[PDB]
Amino acid sequence: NVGYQNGFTANVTTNYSHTTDNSTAVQDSNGESWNTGLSINKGESAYIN
Amino acid sequence: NVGYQNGFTANVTTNYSHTTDNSTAVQDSNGESWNTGLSINKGESAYIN
């Protein structure tokens, strides 16, 4: 950066850095389900008397 | 960093830090489903009179 404050000024900055990280997690689950169902046979589909 | 403000200036900064974190979450779910289907036998596939 440059600028004006009681005359001309300038600054040049550098930077470097190194971070590390580690973590856990635990996740449960639970559920239920239902179902129905049919079928049919077209041809030979009923019996009579 | 180095620079010029009323003469030569320089600065050297260090840094270190340590953060922790923990969190929860709760997720529900719901759904429905439909299905159809056929079948055939290519041979003995029709009866007659």
**What's the CA gap between B16 and A14, in Å, rounded?**
17
- Say how many Å lie between the first and final Cα of chain A, rounded: 102
* B2-4, strands of its sheet edge to edge: A2-4, A8-12, B2-4, B8-10
Interface test with B, best of A6, A8, A11 (most B CBs within 10 A): A11
CA–CA dist B18, A19 (Å, integer): 10
Residue of A nearest to B1 (CA): A13
Could you tell me if A24 lies within 8 Å of chain B, comparing CB atoms? no
Resolution (A): 3.7
Distances in Å between the Cα of A9 and the Cα atoms of A14, B11, B12, B13 are 17, 15, 19, 20
What whole-number distance in Å separates Cα of residue B6 and Cα of residue B37? Answer: 87
R_g of chain B computed on alpha carbons? 39
Task: Give the integer Cα–Cα distance in Å for A46 and A41.
Answer: 9
Contact call for residues A11 and A1 (beta carbons, < 8 A): yes
Q: Which of B11, B16, A6 is nearest to B3 (CA)?
A: B11
Q: What radius of gyration, in Å, describes the C-alpha atoms of chain A? A: 39
